[PDB]
DNA sequence: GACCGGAAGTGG
DNA sequence: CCACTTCCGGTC
């Protein structure tokens, strides 16, 4: 797979029919996984990695902290916030 | 349990 | 190369 997790989360987030498992909620960029497990099995599907689970996916998100692509929303389960500072950069090619 | 981050490894 | 994937030893 060549798609990126943040890109894929957005894809999902861009249709509200997927709200049964992920949804925008809060200030600009915030969202929460209403079904963390379905999100993971989907990402797994998409990347042909079928042992994907939330514990692994969440690790990948944690890596995004240093990249400023995302922060954790503190004291809110399964909630993160996209940050534009780093998205801007990750949208740039070579 | 959830969340954190180090470390090794992987495959488009 | 690099963004993950896998796994794990810690904090609550």
Curated annotation (Swiss-Prot):
Give the coiled coil ranges.
Answer: none
Please list the residue ranges the record marks as binding DNA.
3-83
Signal peptide start-end: none
Superkingdom classification of source: Eukaryota
Q: Where in the cell is it found?
A: Nucleus; Cytoplasm
Q: Which disease is it linked to?
A: Ewing sarcoma: A highly malignant, metastatic, primitive small round cell tumor of bone and soft tissue that affects children and adolescents. It belongs to the Ewing sarcoma family of tumors, a group of morphologically heterogeneous neoplasms that share the same cytogenetic features. They are considered neural tumors derived from cells of the neural crest. Ewing sarcoma represents the less differentiated form of the tumors.
Instruction: Report the family membership.
Output: Belongs to the ETS family.
User: What is the protein's quaternary organization?
Assistant: Identified in a IGF2BP1-dependent mRNP granule complex containing untranslated mRNAs. Interacts with SETDB1.
Q: Provide the function of this protein.
A: Transcriptional regulator. May participate in transcriptional regulation through the recruitment of SETDB1 histone methyltransferase and subsequent modification of local chromatin structure.
Q: Which named protein is this?
A: Transcriptional regulator ERG
Species of the source: Homo sapiens
What gene name is given for the protein in this entry?
ERG
Mapped onto the parent protein, the portion here is: 309 to 402 of 479
